[PDB]
Amino acid sequence: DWGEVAENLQEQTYNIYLTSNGTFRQDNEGNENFNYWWNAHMLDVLIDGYERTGDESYLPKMKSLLEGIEVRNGNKYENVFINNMEWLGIACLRTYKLTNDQQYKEVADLLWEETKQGWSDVHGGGIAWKTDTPNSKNACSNGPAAIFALYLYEIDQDEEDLEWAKKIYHWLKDTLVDPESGLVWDNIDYHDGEAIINRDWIFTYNVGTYIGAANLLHQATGEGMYLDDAIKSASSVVAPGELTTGGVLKNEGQGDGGLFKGILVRYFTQLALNPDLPDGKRNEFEEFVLFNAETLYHNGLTSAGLAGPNWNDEPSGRVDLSTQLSGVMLMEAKALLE
Ligand SMILES: OC[C@H]1O[C@H](OC[C@H]2O[C@H](OC[C@H]3O[C@H](O)[C@@H](O)[C@@H](O)[C@@H]3O)[C@@H](O)[C@@H](O)[C@@H]2O)[C@@H](O)[C@@H](O)[C@@H]1O
Ligand SMILES: [Ca+2]
Ligand SMILES: [Ca+2]
Ligand SMILES: [Ca+2]
């Protein structure tokens, strides 16, 4: 029972990482630092549990987390990293779609206004990484911005938001997507006076949000090109290459990188749920999530239920919250697909 596994991990995560004010600590050792974007993804994990169970017990924990983020972020929701605001805004819109709780919509509305301010024509378009890095346009600040815009379009049907989604996605595809594989390069910035793309950094979460944005744009327009884009990127995830070792999504370390795998699995799974996906691709994608979930469960989880950065080995020491969230996201995705 994969839902039973996910619920066990939800409980272990909440029990080990909950700190004051309804937020979640950086690790299970000596660090109580508040990580804004990690806590945003804990909200996503709590939403995963709510959708699977229908258990209203998740709702007060979600609300306490939303309000605790405001306090620990300095009595505000704005953050210097634009991608951080995008992650929280996405989770807030997800919550509003399921609960109609206007408090989440108001936060999302604020964060969308800030996200749109990061856009510029530097490097041809794209949302900046930070409010003060006008020249650094990163996949992690554009993939999520498109997803953000698409959720808002589903909710408010403002034509300007669909235009934003299309413009963000098409800049991302034209700039940071490898035309041969569909995988996503990390960023473009000025180095020694000229624009350079970091092609060495190919992370699971960047192709993850590209897949997620393409899937949502296909749903919002019906244009097959978006589905073709998503299938190509997801097929490269499955086939041997940069992001897998022995068919398992690879170790990307702890800290921020601990969260990368879970984000890819979330949006990969959403593509596997698209009704227009061909049967053979759906089977291949479902089998890939199962293989990863089985690997983590049997090889990578501690007996208490903590996941490490390598899904194929148990962590012997500190477990960052980000790393743990990727494990819970994997199990929730597996339970969703059964
Ligand atoms: O070794 C450096 C980092 O490499 C890997 O992270 C890749 C990303 O690094 C940057 O983003 C990191 C964090 O920056 C802010 O705090 C905020 O935006 C956070 O949300 C963000 O995660 C940036 O260059 C991104 O474009 C890269 O993709 C991981 O291994 C990290 O853990 C590691 O510290
Ligand atoms: Ca429970
Ligand atoms: Ca209920
Ligand atoms: Ca305030």
Author numbering: 54 to 391
What is the paper's account of this structure, in its own sentences?
The marine bacterium Salegentibacter sp. Hel_I_6 (Bacteroidota) isolated from seawater off Helgoland island (North Sea) contains an α-mannan inducible gene cluster with a GH76 family endo-α-1,6-mannanase (ShGH76). On overall, ShGH76 exhibited endo-α-1,6-mannanase activity with a preference for linear α-1,6-mannans. The tertiary structures of all three ShGH76 variants indicated a single-domain protein with a classical (α/α)6-barrel fold, with six α-helices forming a core that is surrounded by another six α-helices. Multiple sequence alignment identified the aspartates D136 and D137 as catalytic residues in ShGH76.
